Amino acid sequence: GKQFTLYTHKGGPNGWKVTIVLEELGLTYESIFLDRIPALIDHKNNDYTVWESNAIIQYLVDKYDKDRKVSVAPGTNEYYTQLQWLYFQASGQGRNEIKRVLGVLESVLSKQEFLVDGKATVADFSFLPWNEGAAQFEEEFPATAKWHKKLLERPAIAKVWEERA
Amino acid sequence: GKQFTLYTHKGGPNGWKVTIVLEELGLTYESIFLRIPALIDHKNNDYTVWESNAIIQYLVDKYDKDRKVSVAPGTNEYYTQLQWLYFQASGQGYRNEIKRVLGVLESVLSKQEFLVDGKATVADFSFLPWNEGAAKFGSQFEEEFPATAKWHKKLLERPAIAKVWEERAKV
Numbered sequence: 089g090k091q092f093t094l095y096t097h098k099g100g101p102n103g104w105k106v107t108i109v110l111e112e113l114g115l116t117y118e119s120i121f122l123d124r125i126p127a128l129i130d131h132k133n134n135d136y137t138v139w140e141s142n143a144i145i146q147y148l149v150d151k152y153d154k155d156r157k158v159s160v161a162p163g164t165n166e167y168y169t170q171l172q173w174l175y176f177q178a179s180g181q182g183r184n185e186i187k188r189v190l191g192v193l194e195s196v197l198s199k200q201e202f203l204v205d206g207k208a209t210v211a212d213f214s215f216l217p218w219n220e221g222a223a224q225f226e227e228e229f230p231a232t233a234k235w236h237k238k239l240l241e242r243p244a245i246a247k248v249w250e251e252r253a
Numbered sequence: 254g255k256q257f258t259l260y261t262h263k264g265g266p267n268g269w270k271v272t273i274v275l276e277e278l279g280l281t282y283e284s285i286f287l288r289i290p291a292l293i294d295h296k297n298n299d300y301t302v303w304e305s306n307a308i309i310q311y312l313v314d315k316y317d318k319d320r321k322v323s324v325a326p327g328t329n330e331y332y333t334q335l336q337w338l339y340f341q342a343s344g345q346g347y348r349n350e351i352k353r354v355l356g357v358l359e360s361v362l363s364k365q366e367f368l369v370d371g372k373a374t375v376a377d378f379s380f381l382p383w384n385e386g387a388a389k390f391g392s393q394f395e396e397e398f399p400a401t402a403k404w405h406k407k408l409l410e411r412p413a414i415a416k417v418w419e420e421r422a423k424v
Contacts, residue, residue, distance in 0.1 A: 124340070124357075136329045140339035147332045162326060165300045168311045175304035176288070178343055192288075 092117035095127040101181070101217035102126050102141040104252060108213050109145050111244040112158045142174045145210050159209050166204055173203045173211035181218045190222065190229045198231040212239055254295075257282035261290040266382035267305040269421055273378050274309045276413040277322050306338045309375050323374050330369055337368045337376035345383045348390075355387070355398045362400040373408065381408055382421075 092110065094117050096103025103119070103126045110117050127139040128147070138144050149159035160166040180189040193215070196203060203211040212235070219236050226233040239245060257275065261268030263286045271290055275282045291303040292311070302308050313323035324330040344354040358380070361368060368376040384405050388394045395402040408414060 133329065136332075138332050138336050140336045140343070143332060143336040143339045146335060150327075163314070165297065168300075168302050168307055171310055172302050172304045172307040175307050175339075175342055178339055179304075179346060182343060182346055 089131075090116045090118040091130065091132050093129040093131070094119045095122060095125055095129075097121060097123055097125060100126060101221065104217040104248070105141050105214055106144050106148075107251075108216065108245055108248050109148050109158070109210055111248050112210075112213070112242075113148060113152050115148070115152060140178075142178050142214060145214065146171070146174070149210055158213070160204060160207075169204045170209055170211045174214055177211075177214040177218070186222045187228075190232055193232045194229045197235050202235070208239065208242070213245070216240070216245065255281045255283040256294065256296050258293040258295070259284045259290060260287055260292075261285070262287060264424065265290065266386070269382040269417065270305045270379060271308050271312075272420075273381060273414055273417050274312050274322075274375055276417050277375075277378065277411075278312060278316050280312070280316060304342075306342050306379060309379065310335070310338065313375050322372075322378070324369060334369045334374055334376045338379055341376070341379040341383070345380075345387075351387045352397070355394075355401055358401045358404075359398045362404050367404070373411070377404070377408055378414070381405070381414065 092115060094103065094106055094110070096106070096119060098121050106126055106128065107117075107119070124139045126141050126144065127137060128144045129135050129137045130147075133151075138147050150162050153159045160170050176189075176192065193203075200206065202208050216236070216239055220240075240249060257280060259268065259271055259275070259282050261271070261284060267290050268284070271292065272282075272284070288303045290305050290308065291301060292308045293299050293301045294311075297315075302311050314326050317323045324334050340357070344350075344357065358368075367373050384401075388402075388405070409418060
């Protein structure tokens with residue numbers, strides 16, 4: 089049946105992150121709600137199991153985004169720039185903190201289209217659920233607001249966003 | 254001159270974290286006191302990266318080809334190692350939060366020698382500076398978390414890490 093099993097909590101922003109990626113990659117999965125988590129089991133890789141959402145996401149793109157539709161290649165400088173943003177997102181998902189995170193984002197996005205290169209990647213996507221909590225916005229962080237809005241309009245993400253309610 | 258420039262704050266745990274890896278890999282570097290930390294690789298057209306665990310990933314993937322202290326990119330173990338690096342960055346951004354983190358560590362290290370089955374990696378190294386502060390909470394560390402305390406202690410005894418710890422001491 090389904091290639092992956094995703095263990096998550098019901099409204100879990102992290103589970104949502106991972107789901108956005110699964111959908112972007114056209115991968116089949118089953119979601120199981122509990123109540124670390126989230127966790128991913130890959131039935132085509134000996135039921136290899138990984139947790140930490142951004143690690144899960146790295147695994148999905150490196151192994152299953154060979155077309156680089158939403159990710160850069162392993163072993164390139166760009167990969168470590170992608171990784172740096174994925175760490176920034178994870179550190180920032182855990183006020184002035186929100187504004188500081190947004191400030192960094194704006195400082196980059198006002199100058200280039202996406203967090204790495206001029207391609208939407210999982211670096212950008214990783215902020216969506218958190219950012220759809222962090223909300224006047226378009227006034228103080230216009231580049232970020234616009235980028236966020238445009239990410240939401242990608243068909244896979246719009247579908248996930250529907251399921252999200 | 255020095256292959257890397259590391260920007261960091263004077264007593265910074267994240268800096269020490271990165272320095273551990275630079276030394277384990279025998280790479281030349283200069284430290285400048287002031288995200289931060291940030292690393293500049295003069296042998297890679299001054300490619301520049303920040304976030305200590307992204308920096309560290311960069312350092313092992315490119316410069317630990319012998320796999321002395323890391324696993325190969327592409328393998329499942331790589332993603333497990335990555336898992337622990339994210340857990341290190343997150344879990345340690347009352348202080349039962351500390352005991353929660355140590356709890357997770359203990360549940361693993363009581364059943365296996367290191368975080369990634371078999372050998373010490375940067376996954377293990379990543380916790381060292383944070384763990385040093387946490388063990389300044391009396392002896393609840395070695396009492397509640399003996400596997401973790403053993404593991405931590407033995408990591409500190411690695412020559413390179415001992416050297417970095419002398420530097421960290423005098424700094």
